[PDB]
Amino acid sequence: SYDRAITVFSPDGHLFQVEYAQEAVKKGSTAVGVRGRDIVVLGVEKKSVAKLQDERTVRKICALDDNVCMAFAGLTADARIVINRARVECQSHRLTVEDPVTVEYITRYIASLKQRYTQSNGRRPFGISALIVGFDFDGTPRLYQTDPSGTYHAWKANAIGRGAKSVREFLEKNYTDEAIETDDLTIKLVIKALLEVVQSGGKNIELAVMRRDQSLKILNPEEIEKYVAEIEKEKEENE
């Protein structure tokens, strides 16, 4: 039994392993999520592969229940075990209280796990941050984020990953009410977002939506070029 304290206090009141783990988040690939009034949509950027092999295994967007989708950033290995324990927990809610899980409840589970996981012995903290999107029962779409310290935190839209503060500046500099008027207009907002942060708007995008009553749906790379094409068309006539 490797009984040793790891997370100790700094002489000025800081947790060095925590704030290094947030840097390991800060070098991860950029993922952006927004919410619509009727259809939520999110997508990771920087697929960054050799573009000559497989890819379904690198999909950084998973579901937890029918109504709960989830993406993340940071290092890949620590994420999926949190995904597994979250799936066991959200199944165990249904083994208990009969309704599906609320996104606020499952995010309190994740952040509550992560905090005591920093409080424990002999453990480096997790080096991931996640965006958790769910349209709950009675159709109130919302989302949250997860700090590596474990502070669940609601948003109307957010963006984490390498080069995310400028993307957040674009989102506050661009988010209106009528931006969430049409669903494809919201997708045009997200593709407008990633595009001006992920530079070359090729096949690096990986978007996935939910119409608040369905499962998740990932568009094939045809509406990527279609929506990017009409985006460059609208910017082309705008210029």
Partner: protein
């Protein structure tokens, strides 16, 4: 209208300055002489008067006298030694032993005593000159200023309140804290206010090449310190001049330790420096040797910590008074935003926050310019910050 008329009449008189200043004689730029119109009074008299009667009078060093008779023993730089004599122009009083004297080349006899050798690399660290830092500028640590100042200057400015009470005031004091806290800056105020010889020493200057070479610099330093009436000796970064004796196996760092031991012996043991006050300053005091930490050498042990809130606000009033700002800002919010910070960091927030006003086109900085300074200097440069492993002084 007289465009060329002021031009050429300006130009021929600006040239005609030089056209008769060659007739003065200022020309033939030298290799180390002097101007022709100066020494013109050593022209016929002292040319034959400071030269033709005046000797060379080579300077020497006395070994000893002997009884009942003058019959001195001389010593010179390379040559032999002699039995020599006074002149009639000198008394036999001030020809004490171990003294340099001026000696003619033929009879080899003594003309005038000389001041001793000073090794002028020690003379280089006499300050000769004062900085401008006022105790107004050292705000936030007023009781440290007072508790220091009563040791430094009150016996020197008033040597009667200690005599008529019947106490000897303490003679040694060190200053220590985290870096950038205002230690060196605090010493500059002392060098501002005082009047005696302020002989600074930076500890890394004493690392010499030869063996025991630094110890002679210590000895000469305390000798010319003893020559004066009252004197102030400043020390800085004395961790380099000694931490502690730890030696084992292959003897390492010994040469520093001999110099540190010579510093100990010059501080205490067999006749005190008397009217000589010392002043040390370090970053980490933990490494220092306890015999150096003994009082009688290091009587006062002034702490420099971080300011609580009000010292910080006072420091904002110091570094922020002399810049064009928005009038209705508050500093108390900023001192709420800086829990653990130095006056150097506060100054960098001020001098950066002005540059934010210089960014676009304004003349007076704003509260949100200050907010752009705080997250950058504190929270963007927070990766290094230099403080926490120095809070424990390790």
């Amino acid at each position: 209208t007289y465009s060329r008329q002021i031009k050429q009449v300006e130009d021929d008189i600006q040239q005609l300055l030089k056209k008769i200043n060659e007739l003065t004689g200022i020309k033939e730029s030298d290799t180390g002489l002097a101007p022709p119109a100066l020494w013109d009074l050593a022209a016929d008299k002292q040319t034959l008067q400071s030269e033709q009667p005046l000797q060379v009078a080579r300077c020497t060093k006395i070994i000893n006298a002997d009884s009942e008779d003058p019959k001195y023993i001389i010593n010179v730089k390379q040559f032999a030694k002699f039995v020599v004599d006074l002149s009639d122009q000198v008394a036999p009083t001030d020809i004490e032993e171990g003294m340099r004297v001026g000696v003619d080349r033929n009879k080899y006899q003594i003309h005038i005593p000389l001041p001793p050798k000073i090794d002028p690399t020690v003379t280089m660290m006499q300050v000769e000159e004062k900085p401008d830092v006022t105790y107004s500028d050292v705000g936030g640590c007023k009781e440290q200023i007072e508790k220091l100042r009563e040791v430094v200057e009150t016996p020197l400015l008033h040597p009667e309140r200690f005599v008529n009470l019947g106490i000897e005031p303490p003679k040694g004091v060190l200053l220590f804290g985290p870096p950038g806290t205002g230690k060196t800056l605090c010493a500059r105020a002392v060098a501002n206010r005082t009047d005696a010889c302020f002989i600074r020493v930076i500890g890394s200057e004493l690392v010499q090449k030869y063996v025991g070479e630094g110890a002679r610099m210590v000895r000469e330093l305390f000798e010319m310190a003893r020559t004066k009436k009252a004197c102030l000796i400043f020390f800085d970064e004395i961790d380099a001049i000694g931490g502690a004796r730890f030696d084992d196996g292959a003897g390492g760092d010994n040469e520093v330790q001999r110099t540190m031991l010579e510093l100990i012996n010059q501080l205490d043991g067999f006749d005190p420096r008397g009217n000589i006050k010392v002043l040390m300053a370090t970053n980490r005091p933990d490494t220092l040797d306890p015999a150096l930490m003994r009082p009688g050498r290091l009587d006062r042990k002034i702490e420099f910590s971080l300011p609580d809130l009000e010292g910080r606000t006072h420091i904002f009033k110091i570094h922020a008074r002399s810049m064009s700002v928005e009038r209705d800002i508050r500093f108390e919010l900023l001192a709420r935003l800086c829990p653990n910070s130095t006056g150097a960091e506060i100054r960098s927030v001020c001098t950066e926050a002005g540059m934010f006003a210089i960014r676009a086109r304004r003349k007076i900085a704003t509260e949100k310019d200050f907010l752009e300074a705080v997250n950058k200097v504190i929270k963007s440069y927070a990766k290094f910050s230099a403080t926490p492993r120095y809070m424990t002084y390790n």
